Structure formats: structure tokens, C-alpha cells
């Protein structure tokens, strides 16, 4: 289950084609944004993708949101702590 | 019903359960096979960590489902 | 290697003492701010902590910034993908 | 030098190395003791993933340092 931006965009197209019985053709990834959230001992990531696809042989632009649950997991033994700032208030 | 539990080193253990079974009971079965105490056990299904109170059926776990096991050292 | 806010504040105080040859005495943690992000195949978390310590036997409030590297790790076999939104533009 | 490699199951491996050694060389040592191929090996020190080309002294890895090992599985 890869996390590369192009694979995520293709997942979006394949999932969209299946849900709405359409047949768009993936062309390119234009831009991507990622925001992450920590839930308990797991990590979640949201991907915001701008992509190129062909609807009727006509190239169009689409925006997709992909939610990845357990994109990461907490392992306490490997974490490394570093102090950046220490000041009185 | 039979379900699969997979370790981070790729080893797979087979379990016998029923949908009514709680997560605490599944951890107990894992403890008997692998000698790991349930308190030190972490179970992941569908991108979520399973809570002790709920049952297998609550998470919509079915035959041939695979769960992921993580240890607390 | 705990990620609990109280343990993190003690780390900040203990590290500050070693770094600046001082000896503040940790009392308690008041509040914390946390945000996480994915770096390569790892996750990092940044902590902003407000705590109480004793300078001369007098309690004071301090603000600390703690950077935790590899607070999480990417494990591909466990991630779960879901498409949330697909729209033209 | 003697360093420690720890698996996610809590197993600890003892190794013999010295600072001139590369990460690729450490992975080779791990394979000889534990039979795991280097491509499937991930090594963690000080919260970062170690690159094969560089040496232990580059990462300031020292006597009794502990490395963390994570496996890459196709499954």
C-alpha cells in the first residue's frame, strides 16, 4: 500500500470511476498538499491532490481528497528528543 | 470463524474466534499461542486500533480478515 | 522514550539545566500544544509546553519547545485508504 | 566496536564493527547473523533513517550505541 503522490492520485481516479461508473483516464499530477493528524498511537494523513484526467478524450482538471488511516504508527523506542527553546513567561 | 493476525516481522498466526468475541478475548487467545500478555498487545484493523470493550462484530471483522499486531516493550 | 507531556517537560527542564549549568526544580506541567508531520518514511512531532519549576525555591512559569524525531514510523501494510471528495476544477 | 541492533519484537542483536564501517557493511553483518537481506533492512538512529553509503562515524554512532531495525516486507 504505497504512499507516493502519483499512486494516490491514480487510486482516486480508480475509486471515482468505480463509484460513479465513469471512465476517466489519468494523465498527470499537478500539485499536492498533505496534512497529518495524530490519533492516539496512530498517525493519519489527508492528501489534497490536483490532477489531470480525460473525460471524453478531453483533458480536464480535478481536485481530490484522500484520507489515509494509520499512515504511521507510534514506536516509543526509536523516538529522539531535542530541545529547541526554553524561556520564562 | 477463523481470522489472521500478522506480526511486523511477517509471521502469521491463525486464530479461532466467533463474532461475539471481544477484543480482550482475542488478545487472550494470542497470549496462549505466543506468550505475550494482553496489556502489551496492540491490534490494528482497517486503520484503527481496536478497543478492549468492543467485539469483533462491532468492527465488522469477518472470516479471513487480517489483523495487525504490535508489541509494547 | 515516553511521549507523555509530563515526561517531556521534565526532559526540557533536565536538558536546560545541563545545557546552561543551572538547576531548576521541576514541579508540574500546565498545558501543551502538539502538531505532527510526515518526514520521508518517519513522523515528527513538535511540542510547545508550559510548566512550573523552582529557581531559588520560588515557583516560576516556563515555556519550552521540544522536537521529537521519529515519534512515529510509516508502515505501509497497515494504512487504509479512502476517497473523500472528487470534483472538477 | 560493539553495537546493539533491536528488532520490533524486542530481540536484541550484538554486533562487531568499527567506525570506518559503512551502513551497507552493518546490514551485511546483520544478514550473516540473522539471515535477512539488506534491501529489506531499515536502520534507525537518533530518529533518522541511515543511508547505506555513509559510515558510523558520520552518524556519531559509538560503543554500546543502539540501532533500531525495521523490516521491508512485500506482504
Author numbering:
A (entry chain C), C (entry chain A): 33 to 121
B (entry chain J): 1 to 73
D (entry chain K): 1 to 75
Could you give the paper's own sentences about this structure?
Ub can be ubiquitinated at any of eight primary amines (on the N-terminal amino group of M1 or the side chains of K6, K11, K27, K29, K33, K48, and K63), and all eight Ub linkage types co-exist in cells (Peng et al., 2003). Affimers are 12-kDa non-antibody scaffolds based on the cystatin fold (Tiede et al., 2014, Tiede et al., 2017), in which randomization of surface loops enables the generation of large (1010) libraries, against which epitopes can be screened and binders can be selected. To understand the observed linkage specificities, we determined crystal structures of the K6 and K33 affimers bound to their cognate diUb at 2.5 Å and 2.8 Å resolution, respectively. Both complexes show a conceptually similar interaction between affimers and diUb: each affimer molecule binds one Ub molecule and the affimer dimerizes to bind the two Ub moieties of a diUb in a linkage-specific manner. The variable loops are responsible for dimerization as well as Ub recognition, and specific dimerization provides two binding sites for Ub I44 patches with a defined distance and relative orientation, leading to specific, high-affinity recognition.
In the K6 affimer, the first variable loop extends the existing β strands, whereas the second variable loop extends into an α-helical turn that bridges to the second affimer molecule and engages in a strand swap of the last β strand. This leads to a symmetric dimer, similar to what has been found for naturally occurring cystatins (Janowski et al., 2001). The dimeric states of affimers in solution and in the crystal structures were further confirmed by size-exclusion chromatography with multi-angle light scattering (SEC-MALS). This showed that the K6 affimer alone is in a concentration-dependent monomer-dimer equilibrium, which is shifted fully toward the dimer by addition of diUb. We found that the K6 affimer bound tightly to K6 diUb, whereas no binding could be detected to K33 diUb. Interestingly, whereas the affimer-bound K6 diUb does not resemble previous K6 crystal structures (Hospenthal et al., 2013, Virdee et al., 2010), the affimer-bound K33 diUb superimposes well with reported K33 diUb crystal structures (Kristariyanto et al., 2015, Michel et al., 2015).
